Amino acid sequence: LFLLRHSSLYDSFYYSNYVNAKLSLWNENGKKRLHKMFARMGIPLSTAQETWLYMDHSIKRELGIIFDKNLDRYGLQDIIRDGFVRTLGYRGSISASEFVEALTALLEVGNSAQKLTNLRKRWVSNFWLSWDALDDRKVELLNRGIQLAQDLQRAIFNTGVAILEKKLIKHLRIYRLCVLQDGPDLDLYRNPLTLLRLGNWLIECCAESEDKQLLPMVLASIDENTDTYLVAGLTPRYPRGLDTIHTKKPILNNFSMAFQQITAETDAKVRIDNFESSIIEIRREDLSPFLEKLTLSGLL
Amino acid sequence: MSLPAHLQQTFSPEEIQFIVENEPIKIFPRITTRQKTRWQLITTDDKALNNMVAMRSTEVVLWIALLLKQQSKCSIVAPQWLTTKELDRKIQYEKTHPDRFSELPWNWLVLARILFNKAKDDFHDPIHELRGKIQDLREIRQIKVLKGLKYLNESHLQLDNLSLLEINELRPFITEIMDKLREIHTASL
Amino acid sequence: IYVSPQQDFSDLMKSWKNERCSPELLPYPHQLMKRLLNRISMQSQLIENISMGNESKLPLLCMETELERLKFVIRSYIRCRLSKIDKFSLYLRQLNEDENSLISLTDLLSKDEIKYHDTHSLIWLKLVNDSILKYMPEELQAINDTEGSVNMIDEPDWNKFVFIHVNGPPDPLLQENEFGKPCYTVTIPDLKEEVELTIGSIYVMRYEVIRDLLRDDKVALI
Amino acid sequence: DDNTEIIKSFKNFILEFRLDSQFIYRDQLRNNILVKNYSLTVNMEHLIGYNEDIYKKLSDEPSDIIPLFETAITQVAKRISILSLPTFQLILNSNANQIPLRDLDSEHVSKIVRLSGIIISTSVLSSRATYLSIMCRNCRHTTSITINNFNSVSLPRSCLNCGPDPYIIIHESSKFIDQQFLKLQEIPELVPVGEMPRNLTMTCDRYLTNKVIPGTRVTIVGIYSIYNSVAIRTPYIKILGIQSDVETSSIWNSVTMFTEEEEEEFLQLSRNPKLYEILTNSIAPSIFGNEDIKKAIVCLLMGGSKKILPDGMRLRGDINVLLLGDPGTAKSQLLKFVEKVSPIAVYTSGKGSSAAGLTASVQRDPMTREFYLEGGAMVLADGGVVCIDEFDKMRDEDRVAIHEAMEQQTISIAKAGITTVLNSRTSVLAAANPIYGRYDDLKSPGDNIDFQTTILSRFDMIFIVKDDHNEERDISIANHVINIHTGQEENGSEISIEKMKRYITYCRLKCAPRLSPQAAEKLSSNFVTIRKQLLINELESTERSSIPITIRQLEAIIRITESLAKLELSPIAQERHVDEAIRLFQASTMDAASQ
Amino acid sequence: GYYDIDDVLADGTEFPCKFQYDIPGLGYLENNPGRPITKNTKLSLPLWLARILAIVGPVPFVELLPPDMFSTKVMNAIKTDPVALDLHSINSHFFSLAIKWIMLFSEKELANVVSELLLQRAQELNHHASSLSIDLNANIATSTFLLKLEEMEKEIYKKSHESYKDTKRWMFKK
Amino acid sequence: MYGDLGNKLVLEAKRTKQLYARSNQDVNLPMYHEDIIRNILKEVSNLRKNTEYLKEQQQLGMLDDKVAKCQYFVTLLCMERNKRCLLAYQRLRTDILDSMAWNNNGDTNNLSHQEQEYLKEYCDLITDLKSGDLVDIDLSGSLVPPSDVFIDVRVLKDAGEIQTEYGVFNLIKDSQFFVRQSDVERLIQQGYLQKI
Ligand SMILES: Nc1ncnc2c1ncn2[C@@H]1O[C@H](COP(=O)(O)OP(=O)(O)OP(=O)(O)O)[C@@H](O)[C@H]1O
Ligand SMILES: [Mg+2]
Ligand SMILES: [Zn+2]
Fold first, then answer.
1. Residue of F11, F74, F77 lying closest to E26 (CB–CB)
2. Which UniProt keywords are given for this protein, alphabetically ordered (chain B)?
3. Does B137 contact chain D (CB < 8 Å)?
4. Most C-beta atoms within 10 A of its C-beta, which of B84, D34, E44, E98?
């Protein structure tokens, strides 16, 4: 669940990749199903929306019992897990997953070639905020990171809703494609980390499920300030928590090889300087030829 | 001018820490420097450092001891006045004598702050208990200082057994108020 | 009288504290400062020699840190002395001008301090004579006048209150009290009062009265 | 039995709670006892962290455990301040979800709740008993009672023969505390569909009294309880904490509620070379153009400086602004923004107002049959700004009832015995339409304005906004509005509403510039030229000018100069401000008069 | 001090005086210029002028009348409740002028009154300076008492507050 | 009267001192009040003219002894008061200039030319002092006692590979060092580095 101990029990379910994948919360039927689940579990809607610290303690203590019988019915059974929780005397206890989420959020939104250099300098600056957040003498930074993480997850949810409602995902035979051109919050996705966050959200919902064949996905976003795309190939993922011989085998990311081959062959003007070779930059007018050649390559 | 206005007529807390860090302390060396290079100091004595033997009590300057502790090459032996029982006794003495200060060292607050910050695993009592005891002692002495401030006058004043940090805290108020009182009195004649 | 480097550092610290808390400008310890500066230079050379050449890591760190500490103490002492000279420039000029006065600047100041005093006095007098004094009549054209409505020469606050610690001799003035403890006796002429200064106690006294004890090292300002 | 253990537990929280190396509550208590503030503010997140069991008790039965946490505080305070003091107040802070005012019902009785609202009325302080000394009528036996103000107490019914109720209170030996009553209305947006806003009665004790004024949004932590006044009880909230965005205490008394760290930020902002541009851009970021009106609004928010001459005459220090123009100009939106940025403001429509609604009204108390005075819009807005929209729809009498309060800043009443002269120091920002809805250039200016010269002369700056159809400007406005519809600078070119409001408060309570001689000579020459210009214009046309230029306009120019100087915390107003003031006056009032 | 700004400001307050001679060509002291100033004239002169005129002149040139800042009402108010009194309104340099007056006339009643006032006020001054705020998430009395302080008391309070604040910052430095 | 201008100048000096005290790190001397000083000196000039006229009248005039004494005393006192106010203002400004000169190792339009010359030659004097027998000490050094031998520092503003006396530091913006405080103390003072 997304930041269980720093938000309401409702928000943790609402803004969770797995829950949204298994319930399709992006449409009204999903919200109805989630409300049905909460009603069945015996948690009043007012109680669930209350923040974690002040929630009624009977339900907080019984959460393990209430979750275990109820979750299997809705297909959300794998939410149950064992993790690491660290407490400093008389302070709130925080888990490893939420700490990592706070650090990542601080990295992402903590705060021609000239603008690119400026953006990279800003990210290098954010590195030190995230590094400071690792010291127990700096807890305000960690709280600031949790707040920013909640904001970022809300924005990613809205963008994914806009993508899925419009059916912007084109299902080709070699891969899936999704290009953003006029979104409301398109300034956010210049950072590779936020773009990968949105990519993971999409990969889990309506791509991991639906009993569809595993197909790699390409996600691209535009920024008017520089008139270029930030393409990002993403590896497919097997259904979560489904141990199997085929699931045991790992899946590699071949987009680096194909991207390099196409860039060398075509006069792409692609930038392949990012450490993650699957992420490049393309000019506004080269994406169509690039994707045509990608489809015709067959090495994806 | 050459000296800032906040360092004129008084010392800063860092200056008091600097002064405190020259007093000797007892350490247990984790290395054997004694021979059966060599330290060469000019501000203190160097014979003790040149003659160290593992797990043998010896005395060195506090700042050298802190430097060694930073390297996990010595374990500071906390003073005898900084045990739980001694602090209970001092608290009782303060409680039973409303008109006097206890006989704590002239560097108890500063040394307590330094050792709690730096050497947390060299005490034989829980750190929280010692922090509580020092807080209680500080409150009692603060009450006594507040009561005693009502006797400022154009003549001398006596504050026996008051520590260095407390005197540094109170130096401006006491000195300026007594100076104004003296000025008024002298103008009278 | 030299004893050991440790004693020299102890006297340096005594002088530093007394100068910081005293209202007047104390005499300069010429011999001690000469010895200390020479030792600083020699120790710097020794550290450089050793460094030019892993068990030896810690001793070098300790020597360098000690050198930093000693340099800081001397720096603060000299800076405070310079500030006091700035405040009492006209007073020291008055001392030198008078011939009946016992004190002379060559004993009360070092060579660097006397150079600073003369140069800064000249500079400031130039500035004020250009800006202001050259327009006033011949009568009000002196930067050191004591016969006007207000005295222009600032003297040290003789009766300033200073915290003192009575540590006794390292004695004719010493005596015992009703309780049998050693003590000193001083008189405050303004109040005609006699105040006992028992050993090992802290007092908030006027500087004038305990000035002689401070000079003889019987008490030390906190 | 259990009470002593509960008291012991809350005493150990105040003596053992450290988050790092500082005892937060032990030190807060000592610092409060030193300034004579016998209370302790505890954050409930810290108590849930020490021992969750202590929070469970304080939340399960609040009116039984809160009285036992006060005595623990008192015992610790005695231990900390007295070397061997009334009962200490406990103020609570919480971050729990706020319950809407109208969602409070039987399910929340005797529970700690958090809610927000608008304070509409405050009562005169009463006196509640905390320690009674009593005696018996017959046998004259002395006793005492101790009372905590948490209800679920009366004098003993039987003595300790003596008839029923034998005890009479001995007042000269008893002790009392302060009590206040507040009415809380729900926020206008929270109200459900087609419903009038609902009220709720609240009571505060001791150090929570005189903390709010009517018309200020607040957040309340308290206990939803009931008191009997058949088998129904009238609900009310027992306040345990008040949080507000308005420093009412600073506004009523001196300068307060600004930390040195907060104060340092304001000085740094004032040192900005182009603070004028930032403030102008910060007003109505979503309205395109109208820069002159935004500068005028900045000056109106800043205000001038008021003077009390030795002979007793007082000079107005506030600026009044009128916006006359065609439809669709965004005058109402500017008024709605100014109501939201100013520390104190009231938005009223000239049509839905009355002479008594503004100023003050005389009301009869149904119980005492005694007439008393209740303040209206201009009293509720005292020390701030009144936004009178639809100024042309107001009736002649209701408009005439505003002249003295606009100029002299006082509301003289002589009705039902009540005879007084209240104080109303407010700035009026009015929006109006011409007679024909659109300013028709064909007809003379005396035909487009029905306002009389007396009311118009009271406005410092008059803006005659005309809508001209220009393709370039039209395209620009279309692009801006579409961007607004489909679509955060905060990079030194704009400051949020909260910071701007705090800066307005700081400047008002910290600066009051004065004119230098050069500015006086400049303004005096300009007044002579403007008056000559009106005369040349009048000689040309038989008709007498509809927009007047009297001494009030000279004083208005002086006020604008002083406000511009105050904007930058400059104790003296120089010519660099006089030029801007003259430019604004020419852009608004001489511009209106020229037509 | 000669270069002490506060002393220069203090020496500039106006004290009542009464001339005792007939000095033509001294009108500028009076409102009107260039007119003789007749004897027994009452006028307010700055201290730096009035004092020297009072000590220099046999009969001096002027006699100092009792200032309204040392009247019987003010002394009674000082004795009743020193802490609650608003000294800033009586005069912003009260203590400096009081010391100067005591020196000029060597009167001991005023000396004792002023000393007691100063001690009692300093008690509350230290009470406020010792009180340091705390931020739980991460007043009125202090402000109302600060508003009443005289200039010298405002300097002493600032110095003591800074000293306490520095010590607290050093002790609890993480 | 005759000291109102001096009083106003001293009030401005008090405001300057209060600003200097309130300011944390950045202090800029207000513009030299040339106009008020010009007015004060003009007033002193008229006072000198008055004294000369009084002396001339006494030499040949009906003036008497008491009247001459009184006027000659009231003019001298006024001149003294003006001089005191002027000197106090100038001394405050010079003290702030001294503090600035020491804060640096050794805008300007605000200063008057005399103050500019004073500051220049005072920095010369400070450097001369630093060159003497106290060379081993950095007289314009840090007045906070040395506490830690090694500190973490961060580069606050980008600059080339500055070659300090202690060594070569590649000051890349947003990069941290683990170094000895003694070496990088000057860079921290200038603002190229921060302790964090
Ligand atoms: N820059 C703008 N200029 C004008 N109108 C705007 C602007 N931006 C938004 N609006 C629209 O203005 C409308 C508000 O009406 P407005 O305040 O302009 O009327 P008014 O001219 O003051 O009143 P009336 O038409 O009764 O005379 C809102 O619909 C708002 O969307
Ligand atoms: Mg409208
Ligand atoms: Zn009875």
1. F74
2. DNA replication, Nucleus
3. no
4. E98
